[PDB]
Design a protein around this motif. Sequence first.
Motif, PDB file in Angstrom:
ATOM      1  N   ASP A 180       0.883  -1.205   0.000  1.00 52.16           N
ATOM      2  CA  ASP A 180       0.000   0.000   0.000  1.00 52.16           C
ATOM      3  C   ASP A 180       0.884   1.206   0.000  1.00 52.16           C
ATOM      4  O   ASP A 180       2.003   1.116   0.468  1.00 52.16           O
ATOM      5  N   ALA A 187      -4.198   1.049  -2.387  1.00 53.79           N
ATOM      6  CA  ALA A 187      -4.341   0.077  -1.301  1.00 53.79           C
ATOM      7  C   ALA A 187      -4.613  -1.347  -1.827  1.00 53.79           C
ATOM      8  O   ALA A 187      -5.457  -1.552  -2.698  1.00 53.79           O
ATOM      9  N   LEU A 234      -9.254   1.471   2.009  1.00 58.14           N
ATOM     10  CA  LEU A 234      -8.733   2.809   1.742  1.00 58.14           C
ATOM     11  C   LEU A 234      -8.925   3.789   2.895  1.00 58.14           C
ATOM     12  O   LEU A 234      -7.980   4.548   3.231  1.00 58.14           O
ATOM     13  N   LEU A 262      -6.013   3.408   5.283  1.00 55.02           N
ATOM     14  CA  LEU A 262      -4.766   3.921   4.688  1.00 55.02           C
ATOM     15  C   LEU A 262      -4.747   5.452   4.741  1.00 55.02           C
ATOM     16  O   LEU A 262      -3.710   6.062   5.115  1.00 55.02           O
TER      17      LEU A 262
END
Length: 411
Positions: free
Chosen positions: A311, A341, A346, A349
């Motif tokens: 990621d 990702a 997401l 992240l």
Amino acid sequence: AHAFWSTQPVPQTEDETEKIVFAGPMDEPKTVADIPEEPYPIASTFEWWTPNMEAADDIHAIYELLRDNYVEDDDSMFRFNYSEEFLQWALCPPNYIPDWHVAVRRKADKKLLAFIAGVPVTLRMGTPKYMKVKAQEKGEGEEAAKYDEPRHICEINFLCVHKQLREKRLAPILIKEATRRVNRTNVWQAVYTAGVLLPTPYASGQYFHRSLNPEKLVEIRFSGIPAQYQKFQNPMAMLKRNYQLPSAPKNSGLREMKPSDVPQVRRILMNYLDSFDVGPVFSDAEISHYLLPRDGVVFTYVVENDKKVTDFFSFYRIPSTVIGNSNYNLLNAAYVHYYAATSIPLHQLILDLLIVAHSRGFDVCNMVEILDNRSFVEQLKFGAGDGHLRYYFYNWAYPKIKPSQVALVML
Ligand SMILES: CCCCCCCCCCCCCC(=O)SCCNC(=O)CCNC(=O)[C@H](O)C(C)(C)COP(=O)(O)OP(=O)(O)OC[C@H]1O[C@@H](n2cnc3c(N)ncnc32)[C@H](O)[C@@H]1OP(=O)(O)O
Ligand SMILES: O=C(Cc1ccc(F)cc1)Nc1ccc2[nH]cc(C3CCNCC3)c2c1
Ligand SMILES: [Mg+2]
């Protein structure tokens, strides 16, 4: 209605845009040899100037023009203040063309009056998925696929005319001369964005902001205390608690990106961007350029799992001048850049992006609803801003697309 844009190879109305079914060029095919050798004529008191955007003193002259004359918010409260380091980064990616950076100066004292810059980009800009379906339904697959190959085009940014020279038709002269210099290198399309409506966008998206330093944002009137907070004894205190973030990242194995990550980041990015109708294709050199950390300019973190990059995210910094506040001179804004990702959602992240930006003294995190940016708006507490960023092509017919089918970040 548009004495200049009506003369240019762009779709002239939404109606026209509504009709477009395939990607491809608007204008007559032309050759380099057809294009005038000499710069476009300009008033004898002005002169064309090609700054060297790797020479500090030339970068500085452009930096001041933009600091004092570039884009403001609608109430003349803020004006972007791109740094000199940011301009060298944005304007000089690998294989850039120095001649695409175009300035006008007053011949007498050499005061810089106007600027526009073009950089190379390789872009997927063939017919979008929904139009390719319609094409298959009509037996028109081959016409729809004709311009599927990634194209080497120009990306235009930083158009600026000095506030004293406004509404003198100088912008069209800058645009003509840029188009000439790009066409002389056998490049015939450009991609550009603007927060104003021009003929005619192929996509449009809202801006979004995520407060990181809400007391400062409210103080400079970037944000208000919203009316619902008045039900509270201490509206501001509740506002700060609302936007509080962890003091350190949550993903184990988050760290800054380093040169050795370039191949794995290129791979995961390029796999991800493929799912979008319009998006850039980056070489290892370009991934290096656009994503390796650069102090005060671009910030990039990878998630490394078993010595593997699974990621990453990046953001870049554009500060804004705050015009007339006694406590604050600058708004320190982080802008969501590219990410991918594969191992985590997401939102998880990007929460790390907000945590890092906050720890680094950023006041706000901004983005447009391109990419999958809508997937983390609610949970990460982004709110829609004013107005819309519109995406355009020059000399390219293109069916209207949703901003969630756009993967080109624009600086
Ligand atoms: C193949 C290669 C092709 C390469 C070129 C591809 C195209 C690139 C196109 C550029 C992409 C730029 C991407 C960015 O950087 S968008 C950021 C633009 N910059 C700013 O907003 C900074 C502050 N404002 C200014 O500096 C000036 O107001 C500007 C320079 C914007 C206009 O100066 P001025 O206010 O003194 O006006 P004029 O009398 O000289 O000119 C009037 C004409 O200009 C048309 N206008 C106004 N705003 C824009 C605008 N943002 N894009 C395109 N056109 C614009 C307007 O519709 C009118 O034409 P028409 O309506 O009469 O027909
Ligand atoms: O940052 C903002 C709000 C703002 C507007 C004018 C100012 F002077 C300062 C701040 N808006 C915003 C939020 C997300 C964005 N993502 C890309 C852009 C544009 C920046 C200017 N070049 C075109 C892209 C962009 C702009
Ligand atoms: Mg003008």
